[PDB]
């Protein structure tokens, strides 16, 4: 679930507030479309797409499905107790939080005019 | 001509080397295509189109045609002595240098992977 996702982000990107990614580029935040403005934005678009896939497993709502996972200094793994849904969205979140850490954050890409650039 | 354009940029953005604009986004540099990456890139996209318009004037080659203009303070004006081609090109360059001075320069957009991003 989203609360867990932001803890995942905390695990991989220690001194950037999770809120910094809530309105970035064309895809970081609720929804997204157009052309990713950078590598960070692109992490979000495959995350979004990853969520789109997990939803195709019916009764699976990526936003609210809680899962089991573990943070061990910069790394993440999903753990036991996950049903098909939890396993899939946990994997989505893991890969996205891992992606965020290896992409530069460009302030110029935060809270952009979606209308103009996307 | 390009030597004069370089000097125009000097006029409106003294604090930056012209070199910084020579390989930026999808449009600042020789040619261009794709989606402008930001406002500065859009300055170049517009400039490119201006040149393409000037090229319709028979015997008009924007890159090479020398024109008359003067830089005063940080303002630019095209002066007497220009034929149809020179006037058109001078105006194109004039507008571009004025545009650059009003757009933020994002370092993340310099020398980007054109095949990936454009
Ligand atoms: C007022 C703003 C609302 C707050 C947050 C909403 C975003 C939560 O996940 C959004 C999407 C995934 O969902 P959608 O964009 O709706 O997914 C597409 C699937 N339809 O993940 P993301 O990849 O876009 C990154 C967001 C970072 C937030 C960190 C902590 C909660
Ligand atoms: C002193 C010589 C230096 C060589 C620099 C090479 C850049 C070509 O600049 C022209 C293009 C426009 O030409 P094209 O892209 O070829 O457009 C014409 C297409 N019909 O303008 P631009 O708006 O794309 C940005 C240029 C910044 C560098 C300033 C040079 C002094
Ligand atoms: Ca966004
Ligand atoms: Ca999104
Ligand atoms: Ca370029
Ligand atoms: Ca160009």
Which domains, ranges and CATH numbers included, belong to chain B?
1-118 (1.20.90.10)
Half-sphere exposure of A38 (CA within 13 A, CB side): 24
Among residues A41, A91, A93, A107, the one annotated as catalytic is A93
Name the one residue in this structure whose structure tokens are 């054109």. B114
Q: Which residues of A touch B35 (CB under 8 A)?
A: 35, 117
Query: Percentages helix, strand, coil for chain B, rounded to the nearest 5?
Result: 45, 10, 45
Phi, psi of A88 (to 5 degrees): -70, -50
The answer to whether B93 touches B71, Cβ cutoff 8 Å, is no
Among A102, A88, A105, A98, which Cα is nearest to A8's? A98
In angstroms, this model's resolution equals 2.0
Preferred mutation among B25, B34, B38, B116 to probe A, highest tally of A CBs within 10 A: B38
Active-site residue, from A47, A91, A107, A109: A47
Q: Please report which helix (H) or strand (E) contains residue A18, including its range.
A: none
């Amino acid at each position: 679930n989203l609360y867990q996702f932001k803890n995942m982000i905390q695990c991989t990107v220690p001194s950037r507030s999770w809120w910094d990614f809530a309105d970035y580029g064309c895809y970081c935040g609720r929804g997204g479309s157009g052309t990713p403005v950078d590598d960070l934005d692109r992490c979000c678009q495959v995350h979004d797409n990853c969520y789109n896939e997990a939803e195709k497993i019916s009764g699976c709502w990526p936003y609210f499905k809680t899962y089991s996972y573990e943070c061990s200094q910069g790394t993440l793994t999903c753990k036991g107790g996950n049903n098909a849904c939890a396993a899939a969205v946990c994997d989505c979140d893991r890969l996205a939080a891992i992606c965020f850490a290896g992409a530069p954050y460009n302030d110029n890409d935060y809270n952009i005019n979606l209308k103009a650039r996307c």
